[PDB]
């Protein structure tokens, strides 16, 4: 129901101060409308709940 590029630009983005991350990272897969995230297994759950 939403574009993955917009969501990746909102969750991550310019600089690390804005990012909701510490020392991981989002990537986009446009072919299948998906995000690929690498972070602490505790931040994955809150990110998942918000973007759901």
């Amino acid at each position: 129901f939403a574009k993955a590029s917009d969501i990746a630009a909102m969750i991550g983005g310019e600089g690390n101060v804005n990012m909701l991350s510490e020392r991981g990272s989002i990537s986009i897969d446009e072919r299948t409308n998906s995000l690929l995230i690498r972070e602490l297994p505790d931040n994955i759950a809150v990110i998942r709940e918000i973007i759901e």
Partner: protein
């Protein structure tokens, strides 16, 4: 009385941009960069330009451009002349069920 109908079609892959066109390209006198003229081409086409996206509950989100332009009269510009264009354009984003029609 008068009545006209036109309908283009396309097939494409999900999340992938596609276009189909039919018309003319008008050569215009000059395009300006830092110093000189790259004379260019304006389009007067009947065109469809689309990017689709499939969602879970049997629905599509479409990013749509549909145009139908023609070549118009030749107006006067400076000491010269040039060709004008007559246009109809619509651009939107809509959300439509799988196999039915909507009026944009």
């Amino acid at each position: 009385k008068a009545e006209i109908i036109s309908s283009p079609r396309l097939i494409t892959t999900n999340k992938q941009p596609a276009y189909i066109e039919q018309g003319t390209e008008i050569p215009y006198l000059e395009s300006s960069s830092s110093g000189a003229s790259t004379v260019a081409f304006k389009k007067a086409v009947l065109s469809l330009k689309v990017t689709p996206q499939i969602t879970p509950d049997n629905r599509l989100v479409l990013d749509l451009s549909v145009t139908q332009d023609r070549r118009g009269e030749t107006v006067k510009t400076g000491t010269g002349e040039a060709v004008s264009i007559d246009t109809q354009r619509i651009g939107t984003q809509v959300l439509v069920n799988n196999g039915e029609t909507v009026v944009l």
